[PDB]
Write an enzyme that holds these catalytic residues in place. Sequence first.
Site, mmCIF file in Angstrom:
data_model
loop_
_atom_site.group_PDB
_atom_site.id
_atom_site.type_symbol
_atom_site.label_atom_id
_atom_site.label_comp_id
_atom_site.label_asym_id
_atom_site.label_seq_id
_atom_site.Cartn_x
_atom_site.Cartn_y
_atom_site.Cartn_z
ATOM 1 N N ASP A 272 88.714 72.353 39.731
ATOM 2 C CA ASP A 272 89.416 71.235 39.953
ATOM 3 C C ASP A 272 89.075 70.020 38.920
ATOM 4 O O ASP A 272 87.956 70.241 38.477
ATOM 5 C CB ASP A 272 89.303 70.639 41.453
ATOM 6 C CG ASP A 272 90.383 69.586 42.037
ATOM 7 O OD1 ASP A 272 91.108 69.222 41.283
ATOM 8 O OD2 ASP A 272 89.898 68.859 43.013
ATOM 9 N N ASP B 143 89.346 66.169 39.184
ATOM 10 C CA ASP B 143 88.925 64.945 39.898
ATOM 11 C C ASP B 143 87.565 65.289 40.674
ATOM 12 O O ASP B 143 87.483 66.281 41.558
ATOM 13 C CB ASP B 143 89.858 64.206 40.770
ATOM 14 C CG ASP B 143 90.881 63.595 39.823
ATOM 15 O OD1 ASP B 143 90.646 63.437 38.537
ATOM 16 O OD2 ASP B 143 91.875 63.333 40.250
ATOM 17 N N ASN C 181 87.365 62.071 54.367
ATOM 18 C CA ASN C 181 86.482 62.725 53.917
ATOM 19 C C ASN C 181 86.598 63.216 52.634
ATOM 20 O O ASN C 181 85.664 63.956 51.909
ATOM 21 C CB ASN C 181 86.656 64.331 54.788
ATOM 22 C CG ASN C 181 87.910 64.945 54.360
ATOM 23 O OD1 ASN C 181 88.598 64.718 53.637
ATOM 24 N ND2 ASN C 181 88.197 66.298 54.901
ATOM 25 N N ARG D 297 96.358 53.089 54.202
ATOM 26 C CA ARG D 297 96.771 54.374 53.648
ATOM 27 C C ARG D 297 97.686 54.298 52.513
ATOM 28 O O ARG D 297 97.662 54.911 51.541
ATOM 29 C CB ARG D 297 97.056 55.277 54.848
ATOM 30 C CG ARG D 297 97.051 56.801 54.466
ATOM 31 C CD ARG D 297 95.700 57.494 54.501
ATOM 32 N NE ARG D 297 95.044 57.137 53.410
ATOM 33 C CZ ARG D 297 95.144 57.647 52.177
ATOM 34 N NH1 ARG D 297 96.155 58.522 51.999
ATOM 35 N NH2 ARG D 297 94.514 57.387 51.132
ATOM 36 N N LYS E 102 94.914 54.389 37.173
ATOM 37 C CA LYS E 102 94.930 55.493 36.168
ATOM 38 C C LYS E 102 94.919 54.772 34.954
ATOM 39 O O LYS E 102 94.137 55.210 34.076
ATOM 40 C CB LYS E 102 96.155 56.554 36.120
ATOM 41 C CG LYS E 102 96.014 57.476 37.289
ATOM 42 C CD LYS E 102 97.559 58.249 37.333
ATOM 43 C CE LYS E 102 97.404 59.672 37.624
ATOM 44 N NZ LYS E 102 98.809 60.203 37.429
ATOM 45 N N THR F 252 94.601 71.482 38.934
ATOM 46 C CA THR F 252 94.462 70.527 39.319
ATOM 47 C C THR F 252 95.892 69.837 39.990
ATOM 48 O O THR F 252 96.990 70.068 39.664
ATOM 49 C CB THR F 252 94.020 69.291 38.185
ATOM 50 O OG1 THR F 252 94.052 67.969 38.652
ATOM 51 C CG2 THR F 252 94.982 69.412 36.984
ATOM 52 N N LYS G 138 97.608 71.197 46.121
ATOM 53 C CA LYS G 138 96.941 71.694 47.040
ATOM 54 C C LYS G 138 96.633 70.765 47.995
ATOM 55 O O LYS G 138 96.889 69.419 47.694
ATOM 56 C CB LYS G 138 95.285 71.847 46.457
ATOM 57 C CG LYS G 138 95.354 72.974 45.083
ATOM 58 C CD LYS G 138 94.173 72.847 44.588
ATOM 59 C CE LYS G 138 93.904 71.712 43.559
ATOM 60 N NZ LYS G 138 92.574 71.592 42.947
HETATM 61 BR BR LIG Z 1 97.782 58.166 32.265
#
Ligand SMILES: [Br-]
Lengths: 470, 470, 470, 470
Positions: B50, B52, B152, B200, B213, B247, B290
Amino acid sequence: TSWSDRLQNAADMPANMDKHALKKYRREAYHRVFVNRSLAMEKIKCFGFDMDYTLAVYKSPEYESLGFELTVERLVSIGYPQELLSFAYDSTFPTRGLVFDTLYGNLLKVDAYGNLLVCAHGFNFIRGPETREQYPNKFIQRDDTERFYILNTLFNLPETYLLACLVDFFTNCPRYTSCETGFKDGDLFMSYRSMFQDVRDAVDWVHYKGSLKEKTVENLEKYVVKDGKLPLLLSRMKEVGKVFLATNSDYKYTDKIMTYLFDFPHGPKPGSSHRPWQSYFDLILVDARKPLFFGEGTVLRQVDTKTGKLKIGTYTGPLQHGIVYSGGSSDTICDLLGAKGKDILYIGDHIFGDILKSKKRQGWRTFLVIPELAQELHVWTDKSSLFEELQSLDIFLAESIQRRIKKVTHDMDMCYGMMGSLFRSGSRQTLFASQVMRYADLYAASFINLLYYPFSYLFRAAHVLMPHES
Amino acid sequence: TSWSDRLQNAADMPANMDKHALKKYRREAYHRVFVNRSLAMEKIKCFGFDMDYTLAVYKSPEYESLGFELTVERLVSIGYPQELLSFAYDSTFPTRGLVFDTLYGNLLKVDAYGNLLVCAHGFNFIRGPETREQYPNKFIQRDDTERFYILNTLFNLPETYLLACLVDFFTNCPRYTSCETGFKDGDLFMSYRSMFQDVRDAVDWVHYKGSLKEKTVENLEKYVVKDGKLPLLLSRMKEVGKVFLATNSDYKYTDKIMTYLFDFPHGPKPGSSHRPWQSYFDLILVDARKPLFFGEGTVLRQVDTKTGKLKIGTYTGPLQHGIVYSGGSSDTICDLLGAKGKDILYIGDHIFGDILKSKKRQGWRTFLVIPELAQELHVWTDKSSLFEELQSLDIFLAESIQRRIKKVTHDMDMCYGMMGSLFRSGSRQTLFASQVMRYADLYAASFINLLYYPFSYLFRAAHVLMPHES
Amino acid sequence: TSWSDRLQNAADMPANMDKHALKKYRREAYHRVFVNRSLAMEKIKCFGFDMDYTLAVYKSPEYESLGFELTVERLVSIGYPQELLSFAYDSTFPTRGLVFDTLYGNLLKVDAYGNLLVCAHGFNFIRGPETREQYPNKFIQRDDTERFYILNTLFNLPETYLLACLVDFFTNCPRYTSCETGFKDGDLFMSYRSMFQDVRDAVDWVHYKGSLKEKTVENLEKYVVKDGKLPLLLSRMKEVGKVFLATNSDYKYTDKIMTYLFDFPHGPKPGSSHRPWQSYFDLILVDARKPLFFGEGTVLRQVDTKTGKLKIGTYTGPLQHGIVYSGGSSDTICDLLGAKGKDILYIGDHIFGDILKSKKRQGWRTFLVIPELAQELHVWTDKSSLFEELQSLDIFLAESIQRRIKKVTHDMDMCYGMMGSLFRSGSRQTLFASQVMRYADLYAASFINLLYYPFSYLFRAAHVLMPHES
Amino acid sequence: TSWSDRLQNAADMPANMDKHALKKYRREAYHRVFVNRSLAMEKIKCFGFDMDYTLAVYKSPEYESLGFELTVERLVSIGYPQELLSFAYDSTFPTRGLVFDTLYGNLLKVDAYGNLLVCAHGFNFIRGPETREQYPNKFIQRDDTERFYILNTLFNLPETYLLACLVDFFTNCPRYTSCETGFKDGDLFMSYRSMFQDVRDAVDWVHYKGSLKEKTVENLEKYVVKDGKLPLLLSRMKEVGKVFLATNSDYKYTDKIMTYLFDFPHGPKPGSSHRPWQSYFDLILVDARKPLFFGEGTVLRQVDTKTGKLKIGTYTGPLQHGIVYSGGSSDTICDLLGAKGKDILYIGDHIFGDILKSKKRQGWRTFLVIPELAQELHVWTDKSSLFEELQSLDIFLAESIQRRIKKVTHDMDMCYGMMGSLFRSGSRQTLFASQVMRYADLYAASFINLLYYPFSYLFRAAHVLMPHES
Ligand SMILES: [Br-]
Ligand SMILES: [Br-]
Ligand SMILES: [Br-]
Ligand SMILES: [Br-]
Ligand SMILES: [Mg+2]
Ligand SMILES: [Mg+2]
Ligand SMILES: [Mg+2]
Ligand SMILES: [Mg+2]
């Protein structure tokens, strides 16, 4: 000598209630209670029971053989070939907790991660390399419930053997052509999946519509373990807490079985007046429909205990002396007995529907009865040389000719039966073992083993540390 | 000193590739790989990753603070009160793996059986007896996913703190009346459930539509751990097997992050030519979705790596050099790389979606990265006196004034933060700990720790025995 | 004079096969085929049949009374009060297609939009204003299948009467207290919903496990319409196309009933050799499990017609002479007979499971048998004065004392029974009527009416125009 | 001359409120209200509205062209070929209510029984015999929603044309190979299903995230019909009952559109003071999320009409003057307005989500706005010769060279467009027509037509009789 022979031998002995006698008796593996998580017995205010294979332990292999015979007879009655009648139950073949693969018609013994430990097609035990063609990663997805059925109950023992008998029979019968996913008989194709469904349906039919119950009650000495210590233990529980029954069985069967279990010319101890079995319970609930019971359940009904039929209506009233309930939910029990989950020790044999769900859904304390342990423990101490040799070999290997590990694993396993121990194959633990460890706080060959510990007893398990904590 | 300060300190050191230097370095807890189940590294033919918090480890508390600030700003933008802007992220409050109870607005730390270890309403830590009113059995049904949300992931850290900030804020703001299940503002009622859903949704929005990002990529040194040993380790893996990336992130972000991770004036070792990050992978898959990836997944697409957009159509062709995939399934990877599950070591940080599902659904081998361990291990060895005193007290107790056990448990726990260790509260293991033990074959503060073991290494865990076997 | 008396009277007459005699006979309403959508009979290449109430028309009220008696006896056997045994079936009460409201325990006759036309609580017919308390909009949501059950089959006639008997009985029995949603008997509460479920379960039990079939076959003259024109019509169909049977009933029952239907000392016409019933069909399929049949169905099985049991396996072979099938799907029929949907006229009595689903899911042509029409048509022509007076009143009103409309509506309705015509209440059409119009291409009191039209006949319905087109 | 040109021409005329002038105006088909079921206007106590294509009628073909252009631009932006930019919307191609078959990439016009009336693959109209290869029974299962998508909204007009453009483009572009279920571009395969999903997603994106709303509000005269009679009619409704708005659109858009619709230098009549649009409504509800609205809906929220954002919390208070609601359910409206279903006339354009569900789930009275009728009615009266010739031919045929029927059907159909009338192909009614008849009590080209009838008007439809009743 079957596990039920061991249990009945122990059952025949009267209880020596001297404190040093009890303390000395539970030193022996056979009479011990085993501990996965610590449990202070003084915190238990309610003891709850399942009936089948808990209070009423069916004798082996007689009971499995009866189930097997009736299931065969049902399949012949609906059109299976007459040759099925030549099958005879063999207790040396099945181990509980095997997975039937409906795609390829194999019985599989697996670990908790779905890795294959044993694979048999009919009576042919398939070696590791030959297993790779159907299981490229030596692995199954055990939650693929459309494909895999896990035979984890004692009632599943006869069908475990019967599946292997049928795969063997069809494979070797020249009328049928063996294909990858079943058998071709000209213009008919019987998949292993359809064959499995017929067997499952027939076992259900035997239990719910056939003559299994009738044949059992006609000869209770042949079919059911009877122990004068059962009334004694239940009477002691009731002195320190509440006692309840929550069974999927109906009242008429429950009453026959329980009457037999308490039929001694005395009550709890020799010389005391006999008391009816119902007097040992603060709450009696039949038709429980576990595992649904531990969620929404069904409506609470009242049994007319004279007619054996349900009174019309949902029962809205209080817990009263002499009332018998039907259906309901685990919350009914808690509310009626004024109990919180952790106040309850629930005693049963169903590692899924009883013990797993009561723990996960309600936080009840759990005691798992594992009847086979009464014989497995004898094999474990008798053949400890083989296991110790395996440990030594696994140790020496970690730092060439490890065919020796495979051979010792085989010889060890065969001491328990063709499908090995319920709990392992060699050094690898089964799924069943992992589920016992995870969800049974306490476990034993019989709940009667609680008789040998005082009610203030603190059952202790060592604390678990992660690898980075050690 | 945060866990990412520890990681970056270790990252700054060049690798000493002498065999005795490596062997000596992994003697230290900080640089060790921990073992739950034995794993022969020689059997691994594919290493999967993965991105991150695995390859791209976001610095703490800077990254959580950015997430927190952006999430607050989004909630204010949709109509939450201006006072939210006065909140400031506090890294000493949240521990990962807490359960938000949407009925009563509490954060709960629980064991694997749903038993309550810690309960906080806003910033008020609720003592055992006061907990009984809302949790009569000191227990929650953790699979009641309509009520309970388990925080989690490392991305859930800022919302964990934000939930407690909001419960505190509304409780103490005179405009609102505190009720059992939320807050009344005249003719408006905000349930804890609706408030939780807004939080959330806002975290999702920040990640997928907001500026998180963009702000990250504008200052990669501030936000992302960079380690010259990363290219070295990945190059060594590729010498002995195949290497892949799978990913959930999109190609444009992945390419920015990965470019930065490999931006050194050299390749694997100092003095070698720099190579593009893509050259380190046999297979690169983005948009993996995923956990669905480990079941049916989505259709396999091809990334136009010039435009960053998907080519039109499902990709039906072979694995080719320079191709980047999007979507697909775990089976795509296996088939394209010619791998069986047990041939793959999958390395990631998501204890559920990565590690649990790859193990349970596919039988992949697993390596869990737990970034907090880099600091928790320091606390564990520094304050081992407190834990050892707890062991001694638990021992002496088993055979009066156990307030001492509660106090030592508190002092120990507070060394890790207000919500204690990720792995336990005093002597009781958390749900998270139990899940690591069950589903991570190997685990460490960083996957870079694999650099200190040879590729023939046999990682060993002791065999597990049941209580009746011991 | 019941509808089955009319049918049997018509059945007793031999067929006059002269063209002018046939043409003259179908001029009478009783012997006509009615047309909702045009149907060119020359395009039909296959005629398909259900058995129950299509080929085997059960005599009324004898058959409903038997069903009723057996259902009452089952409810008493499981614990309902002895007073139920004093009930006696009354054919003047039930009309087919009523809705049981399980919340409030009412039988409702509704239009296609869920508007209330008639409401009865037990035997009390509730007037419009009193209906508003429970039905504020004089409307039900008929797709709320948890609350409402639509009694649209002829097998539902006895339970329709039995529900009203039970609501009456419990209401008037001093042991029970009437509540809004059921009856209180101290600590027991019987909701109308639970009572309804017991009745539904008991009707199912009577049909599938009880003695209804056995009692029917013991006296076929008492219970089943027999018509020498049935073999004649089926023989004519087979001269111009293929003929099939697709029945939910099992082979053993089907064979008994069909043998009786064909038991004449001749074949199709007097003087011809008798032929077994199976010879009239190109394809015979039992255990069809409609409506599922029209989607995925179940696996195709072959009946051993000697043993009456299923051969083991899925049947993979071709249509052969003498084979009897079990299960399968509508696609099996189409493929085996080389038919497209519109080539098939499917003849049955189930407005939902037969006719609706074959039309909607497969585009089959449909012929609905409505046995009650054989008597309703007599009432319709005898009492046409009342309907014509209603038309005139509705006309005069559209441009004061419209109590007259309510009274004439009542007198008209009572001519058909207490619950009025199957097809309307006064000027308002029922749900059942709307469903017939929508999904039955053709309909009649009996499919035997097809005998009076040549096989080139074009059945014509007038084209429908929208209001803006007129 | 488009349907919206007709509407705007009628909109430009001031209302002549003399009773004989009104009575004379509604004699013309264009200004009539059509009646499927009788409706006494005096029983209506509440008038409810949707906004889009009901109050705000978007001009044609300008609005569809804007939607089309933006959707094309989105598809190019995500990677579709540049050639898409050469497409230009053609209003002569699409008819509303066509079915896209995602398996074979055809647009289908069907009747209510799923029978095929027209089939086009791209711009190729497939004749009857060539249709049989893909549709053996000239039939589709229209409830197979995985395969078939019914384009029944006015917002679906641009995608209807765009689907056909794309199938044409890919078919004729030498880069792609045409396959049965999509297009092959080497190692990429684009199924018609995936292509359809991209188009659907892009239309959604244009509406919810793109610039469609912004471009609309920048030029309201170009895009929206404006009629001074709208305020007049709504004011008259409010004199005799309550008026409400229930729109899926958000408050900010709703306020822009509604402000424009009411922007005249006067109120209801010339010379009266202008009043804000909100004053015309007793209840205003935005974000309705119909069709879910007619079942459980979502929580009732309150709009801060200054900020345009939602107040935090569920709104628990009463209907107050000046409040604007968001979400909720149809029951909220009923309760807040003190209305029963049959008291409400709900006016909208969505034959499914508005009109079908309000009727079926709640028993509301319904008025369907069908904007295309404003032009279809002109074609219907202009070309009545062709239809009358078809009737005559269908009559003569029922008792050789029926190619004439096919040709006249074609010439008639082409008068409406390439995909024929919304309501029929020749003598066969469409699914859409059948749904209008079944679920719209009243219908018209515009709800403004209600202005020409008094509020005591009794709208009359003739009673329906079954074939056996006639
Ligand atoms: Br980006
Ligand atoms: Br029994
Ligand atoms: Br029978
Ligand atoms: Br806007
Ligand atoms: Mg299965
Ligand atoms: Mg939730
Ligand atoms: Mg129901
Ligand atoms: Mg679709």
